[PDB]
C-alpha cells in the first residue's frame, strides 16, 4: 500500500553526481592508462557487472586504486562514468567504437545494446 | 546531444538497496533509541538535508555512528530509510504523525509535503 515519489531516483542520482563533482566520500580511483577518475564504489557496482564483481571480492573490495586493462580508452571510460552518474550517454560517431568496447569490458549491457543498434543503422 | 536511458536512475537505486540489504560497503550506523540502522552516507546525504549537513562537516564526516534525537521514532526512521532506498513510502494512519515528524527532522521536504496533504484531507 506504499505511495511512490516519481522523481526520487533521479534526485538521488543528481546528488550522487554532485558528491562526485565535489570529490565528497569518493573511495576509489580508477586508473585508465595516464588518466585517473575518482568515484564511489557503490555507484560503480550498481552500474557495472565488472565493478560489481571486483568490489564483492573479499580482497579487491578494500583497494583504493583499480587499474583497468591497458586497451581501455580513457575518453570511453569518462563517457561511461558520466553515464553512470547521470543516465546520459554522450554517444558520437567519433567515440562509438571506444564506448562500445569499454561498455563490453565494464559489462554495461544496455549501453552495449544501443551502441550495437547505432552501428547497425550506419552500415 | 546525449541520449538518455529512462530506467537508469531507478536501476541504480535498486542496486543501492540490494547493497544495503547485503550490508555491502555500508559506512555508518544510525542509532535511533534502542534501534540501529546501517546505511551508506552518500545515499543519506542525497536524500536528507540533515545528513547532507552532518556528513559535509569536517569532523562528523568521519564518524561511523550517528545518534539521532531521542524524540525520533525508530519505525518512522525505518519507513524513511526504506523510502530513501526505494522511492516508496509506507504511509499509514497509524504511522503518519511519526513519519512527518521524522521527515521534518531529517529535512525531507517532499515527504513532509505529502504528509501535510494526507493529514489535511482527514480533518
Amino acid at each position: 500500500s506504499c505511495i511512490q515519489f516519481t522523481r526520487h531516483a533521479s534526485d538521488v542520482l543528481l546528488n550522487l553526481n554532485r558528491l562526485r563533482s565535489r570529490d565528497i566520500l569518493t573511495d576509489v580511483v580508477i586508473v585508465v592508462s595516464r588518466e585517473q577518475f575518482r568515484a564511489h564504489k557503490t555507484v560503480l557496482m550498481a552500474c557495472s557487472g565488472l565493478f560489481y564483481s571486483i568490489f564483492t571480492d573479499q580482497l579487491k573490495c578494500n583497494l583504493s586504486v583499480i587499474n583497468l586493462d591497458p586497451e581501455i580508452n580513457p575518453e570511453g571510460f569518462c563517457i561511461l562514468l558520466d553515464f553512470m552518474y547521470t543516465s546520459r550517454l554522450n554517444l558520437r560517431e567519433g567515440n562509438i567504437m571506444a564506448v562500445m568496447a569499454t561498455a563490453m569490458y565494464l559489462q554495461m549491457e544496455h549501453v552495449v545494446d544501443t551502441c550495437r543498434k547505432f552501428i547497425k543503422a550506419s552500415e | 546531444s546525449c541520449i538518455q536511458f529512462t530506467r537508469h536512475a531507478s536501476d541504480v537505486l535498486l542496486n543501492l538497496n540490494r547493497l544495503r540489504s547485503r550490508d555491502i560497503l555500508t559506512d555508518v550506523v544510525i542509532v535511533v533509541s534502542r534501534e540501529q540502522f546501517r546505511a551508506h552516507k552518500t545515499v543519506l546525504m542525497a536524500c536528507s538535508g540533515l545528513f547532507y549537513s552532518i556528513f559535509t562537516d569536517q569532523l562528523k564526516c568521519n564518524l561511523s555512528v550517528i545518534n539521532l534525537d531521542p524524540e525520533i521514532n525508530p519505525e518512522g526512521f525505518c519507513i524513511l530509510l526504506d523510502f530513501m532506498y526505494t522511492s516508496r513510502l509506507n504511509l499509514r494512519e497509524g504511522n503518519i504523525m511519526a513519519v512527518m515528524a521524522t521527515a521534518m527532522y531529517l529535512q525531507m521536504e517532499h515527504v513532509v509535503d505529502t504528509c501535510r496533504k494526507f493529514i489535511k484531507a482527514s480533518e
Binding site: C2, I3, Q4, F5, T6 | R88, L89, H110, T114
Partner: peptide, 4 residues
Amino acid sequence: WVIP
C-alpha cells in the same frame, strides 16, 4: 506522488 503516485500509486505505483
